[PDB]
Design an enzyme around this catalytic site. Structure first.
Site, PDB file in Angstrom:
ATOM      1  N   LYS A  96      -0.665   8.976   7.663  1.00 49.93           N
ATOM      2  CA  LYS A  96      -1.689   9.720   7.303  1.00 49.93           C
ATOM      3  C   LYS A  96      -2.272   9.426   6.049  1.00 49.93           C
ATOM      4  CE  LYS A  96      -1.579  10.828  11.626  1.00 49.93           C
ATOM      5  NZ  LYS A  96      -2.628  11.867  11.937  1.00 49.93           N
ATOM      6  N   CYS A  97      -1.171   9.315   5.083  1.00 51.24           N
ATOM      7  CA  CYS A  97      -1.218   8.908   3.774  1.00 51.24           C
ATOM      8  C   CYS A  97      -1.171   7.585   3.482  1.00 51.24           C
ATOM      9  CB  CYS A  97      -0.260   9.565   2.643  1.00 51.24           C
ATOM     10  SG  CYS A  97      -1.152  11.441   2.490  1.00 51.24           S
ATOM     11  N   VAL A  98      -0.281   6.962   4.168  1.00 53.06           N
ATOM     12  CA  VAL A  98       0.255   5.601   3.903  1.00 53.06           C
ATOM     13  C   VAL A  98      -0.749   4.525   4.504  1.00 53.06           C
ATOM     14  CG1 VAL A  98       1.726   3.527   5.372  1.00 53.06           C
ATOM     15  CG2 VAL A  98       2.750   5.143   3.480  1.00 53.06           C
TER      16      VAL A  98
END
Length: 133
Positions: A96-98
């Protein structure tokens, strides 16, 4: 002895994690990794998720960098390598961040739960079990 992969005790289940890359963060991850030699002989597993020590706990042992390799795999290690981004930001689903957020990494995490062979790198596979070992 006498082999292409030349290695003792061959695994079976190849657990590959996703950590951003190119077009298909997931595909480009392994899909692209295996996009090298041939594909077969073994079953490749392409999954995108945070390399939590929880599950890595196993690899953490069968590796010198264990988690460090993971936290070091992503950008701002000192951040995640500690308690920073590592927080509930990358924890659960780091994808979700990567996915492109925080930072846009391009590292492939290859971990073997069959022979207990892990290595933060796409070459780790080719070296051990390429697109087809």
């Amino acid at each position: 002895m006498s082999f292409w992969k030349t290695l003792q005790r061959q695994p079976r289940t190849i657990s590959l994690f996703t950590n951003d890359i190119a077009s298909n963060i997931k595909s480009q991850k392994c899909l692209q990794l295996l996009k090298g030699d041939v594909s077969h002989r073994f079953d490749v597993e392409i999954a995108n998720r945070f390399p939590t020590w929880d599950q890595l706990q196993y690899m953490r042992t069968s590796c010198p960098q264990g988690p460090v390799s993971l936290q070091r795999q992503i950008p701002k290690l000192d951040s995640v390598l500690k308690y920073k981004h590592t927080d509930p930001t990358f924890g659960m689903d780091l994808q979700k961040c990567v996915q492109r957020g925080l930072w846009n990494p391009k590292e492939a995490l290859w971990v073997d739960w069959e022979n207990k062979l892990v290595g933060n790198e796409p070459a780790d596979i080719d070296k051990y079990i390429i697109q087809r070992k």
